């Protein structure tokens, strides 16, 4: 009908369930609620064996699975979105699609907030001036008002500088790489001149 536009487009049959779940939850403005219920369901399948038996065992009938998922999800602040979603995934035997629908829901939510998770690998631990002059250098690697979520790391094999890891792209602004590409260029010149 009239659903909100998804923040970023995705692949098929496990991410389309997440895009539909996101558009329904943004139509109800329960975006942080059903993400929390999805995390609670990940932990639920982590905790008990009888619950993941309804997702892995092929000999449980559909009637048992849909009636257990209906009867155990009657109340307790679970939204109509999550309860109808688990009815819809239990009706089809597709309860195994939860672990792959939550990561696409997470990517959808991490795109509606205009954020970006990153990893800064520095040779030494950072100060409160060695960090503040880094993020203004790191914010030119996003193309909009994306606020990076700083993640610091340590690696002594860098000789100072920083490496950014955006999980999509990697900027090697280190010195140990700079003295590597210095020697390659100076050796590729002396073999010419």
């Amino acid at each position: 009908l009239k659903l909100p536009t998804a923040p970023l487009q995705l692949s098929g049959t496990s991410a389309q369930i997440a895009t539909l779940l996101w558009q329904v939850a943004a139509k109800e403005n329960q975006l942080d609620k059903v993400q929390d219920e999805l995390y609670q369901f990940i932990e639920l399948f982590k905790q008990h064996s009888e619950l993941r038996r309804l997702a892995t065992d092929p000999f449980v009938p559909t009637l048992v699975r849909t009636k257990i998922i209906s009867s155990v999800l009657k109340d307790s602040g679970a939204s109509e979105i999550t309860k109808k979603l688990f009815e819809a995934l239990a009706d089809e035997g597709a309860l195994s699609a939860l672990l792959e629908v939550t990561v696409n829901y997470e990517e959808l939510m991490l795109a509606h907030k205009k954020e970006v998770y990153c990893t800064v690998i520095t040779a030494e631990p950072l100060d409160k001036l060695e960090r503040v002059e880094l993020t203004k250098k790191a914010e030119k690697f996003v193309d909009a008002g994306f606020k990076l979520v700083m993640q610091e790391k340590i690696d002594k094999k860098l000789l100072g500088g920083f490496v950014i890891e955006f999980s999509d792209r990697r900027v090697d602004m280190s010195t140990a790489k700079k003295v590597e590409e210095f020697n390659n260029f100076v050796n590729k010149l002396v073999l010419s001149i």
Partner: peptide
């Protein structure tokens, strides 16, 4: 780690999106 059983989704149908949209669009109030 028992979550490794749920790593790959086992889809018994291809048009599952139509069934879950028949059940998630009526979840809107």
């Amino acid at each position: 780690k028992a979550l490794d059983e749920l790593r790959k989704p086992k889809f018994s149908s291809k048009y599952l999106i139509q069934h879950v949209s028949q059940k998630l669009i009526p979840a809107v109030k």
